[PDB]
Ligand binder design. Sequence first.
Ligand SMILES: [Ca+2]
Ligand SMILES: [Ca+2]
Ligand SMILES: [Ca+2]
Length: 79
Amino acid sequence: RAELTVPEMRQWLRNWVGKAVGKAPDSIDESVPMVELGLSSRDAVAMAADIEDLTGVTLSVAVAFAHPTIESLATRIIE
Ligand SMILES: [Ca+2]
Ligand SMILES: [Ca+2]
Ligand SMILES: [Ca+2]
């Protein structure tokens, strides 16, 4: 499949968060609230910009906090 997939989006988010908080991406828990992962508000701005560059989607506050886990956010960005 050519289009960006949910597994790819999940991996991209784990890698992004892992780099921001200094942890292995494989250890990033995809079911916990993203506000509990150790990200800063500056991180949120940067990650939103990077998601827009990757997907062309400008994430709204509403969508993001209604899908507040890596796995639910990834699913909603793609789907
Ligand atoms: Ca950091
Ligand atoms: Ca979990
Ligand atoms: Ca841009």
